[PDB]
Design a binder for this molecule. Structure first.
Ligand SMILES: NCCCCCC(O)(P(=O)(O)O)P(=O)(O)O
Ligand SMILES: [Mg+2]
Ligand SMILES: [Mg+2]
Ligand SMILES: [Mg+2]
Length: 310
C-alpha cells in the first residue's frame, strides 16, 4: 500500500475476515453475469463484508453487487456519450422493475432483466416490510444517479456538503445497511435499527468506504477531468491543491475509523441490553452484534479491495 493510501489503524486493528463460501461465490456470480448477458464472454468485496450470511443470501448480494458495477459502467457510458434519452428510459425502467421485478425478468434490456432477477431474489428472504424499505432506499439511489448524470454532462462540480449528501445515496449507504439484516437472518424493528448508536455506526462504516474510494481515485479522476469526488469538490470550491485535498480526504477517512471505534462500543452495549433474558431479546441482541460486526468488516474489506482490484 502506497503511503498516501496506507491506514495503520485498519492494518493493526481491523483484521480481515473471509466468508467460507467465497470460492463458489466468485464463479457463480460470473456464471450469473454470463447467463444474464451482462458482460461479454468484486465478490471478494462482499465475502469480506457479510460474514455469517447464509450461502444463498451472500450469493444474491454478490450478484446484486456485480449488477451494480455493470450499472455504474452503463451510467458512465451514457454520460460520456450524451445519451440522455437512453439514460432517462433506463432510469424509468429501474424504478418500475424495483416495485414489480417479476414483470421485468425477461425485459429486452439485459441490464433491466438482470436487475429484476437480483431484486426478486433479495425480496425472498425477509418480510415485505423489509422489501418495501429496500425499495424506498433504492428509488432514492436511482434519483441520485440521475443527479450525477445531470452534474457530469454539464461539468458541474457539487459543493463539498452537497457532494457528501449526494454520495450517501450514489454509494447506496442505506442499501448496504439494509442488507446486513438478511445476512443475519432478522428484520430489525425500527426502534432497534434507529437506535442512535446503531445508526451512527452504520453511517460511519459507509462514509469510510465511500471516502476511501474517493481517496483511491483522486489523482486518476483529475487527469481525465471528472467532477464527482470529495477531493475534486475540495479543490474546486475550497481552492485546495491536489496534495492538500489528498491530506484532507485522508484525515476525514482516518476520523471515520476512530469515531466508529467509539460508537461501536455504544452499539455493542446496546446489543448487551437487548439480551434481557428472553429468547426474542437474545435473538435481537445476536442480530445487532452480527450486523455491527459486519459494519466493522466493511472497513477491512474495502481497504484491501482497493489494493487488490483492477
Ligand atoms: N467499495 C468499492 C466499490 C465502490 C465503487 C464506487 C464507484 O462505483 P467507483 O469509484 O469504482 O467508480 P463510484 O461511482 O461510487 O465512485
Ligand atoms: Mg464510478
Ligand atoms: Mg458512480
Ligand atoms: Mg469512486
Amino acid at each position: 500500500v502506497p503511503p498516501s493510501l496506507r491506514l495503520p489503524v485498519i492494518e493493526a486493528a481491523f483484521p480481515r475476515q473471509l466468508h467460507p463460501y467465497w470460492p463458489k461465490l466468485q464463479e457463480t456470480t460470473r456464471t450469473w453475469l454470463l447467463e444474464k448477458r451482462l458482460m461479454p464472454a468484486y465478490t471478494d468485496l462482499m465475502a469480506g463484508y457479510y460474514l455469517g450470511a447464509p450461502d444463498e443470501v451472500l450469493q444474491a448480494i454478490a450478484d446484486y453487487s456485480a449488477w451494480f458495477s455493470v450499472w455504474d459502467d452503463r451510467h458512465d457510458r451514457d454520460i460520456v456519450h450524451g445519451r440522455a434519452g437512453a439514460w432517462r428510459r433506463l432510469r424509468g425502467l429501474l424504478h418500475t422493475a424495483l416495485d414489480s421485478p417479476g414483470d421485468h425478468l425477461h425485459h429486452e434490456d439485459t441490464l433491466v432483466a438482470g436487475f429484476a432477477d437480483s431484486v426478486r431474489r433479495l425480496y425472498a428472504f425477509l418480510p415485505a416490510t423489509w422489501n418495501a424499505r429496500f425499495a424506498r432506499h433504492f428509488h432514492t439511489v436511482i434519483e441520485a444517479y440521475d443527479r450525477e448524470f445531470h452534474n457530469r454532462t454539464r461539468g458541474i462540480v457539487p459543493g463539498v456538503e452537497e457532494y457528501l449528501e449526494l454520495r450517501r445515496l450514489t454509494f447506496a449507504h442505506w442499501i448496504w445497511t439494509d442488507l446486513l439484516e438478511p445476512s443475519s437472518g432478522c428484520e430489525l424493528p425500527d426502534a432497534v435499527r434507529k437506535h442512535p448508536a446503531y445508526r451512527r455506526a452504520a453511517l460511519l462504516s459507509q462514509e469510510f468506504a465511500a471516502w476511501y474510494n474517493d481517496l483511491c481515485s483522486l489523482p486518476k479522476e483529475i487527469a481525465g477531468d471528472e467532477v464527482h469526488n470529495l477531493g475534486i469538490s475540495l479543490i474546486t470550491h475550497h481552492s485546495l491543491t491536489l496534495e492538500e485535498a489528498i491530506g484532507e480526504v485522508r484525515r476525514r477517512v482516518e476520523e471515520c475509523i476512530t469515531e466508529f471505534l467509539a460508537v461501536e462500543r455504544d452499539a455493542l452495549r446496546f446489543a448487551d441490553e437487548l439480551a434481557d433474558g428472553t429468547v426474542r431479546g437474545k435473538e435481537l441482541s445476536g442480530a445487532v452484534r452480527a450486523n455491527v460486526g459486519n459494519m466493522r468488516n466493511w472497513f477491512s474489506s474495502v481497504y484491501w479491495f482497493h489494493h487488490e482490484s483492477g
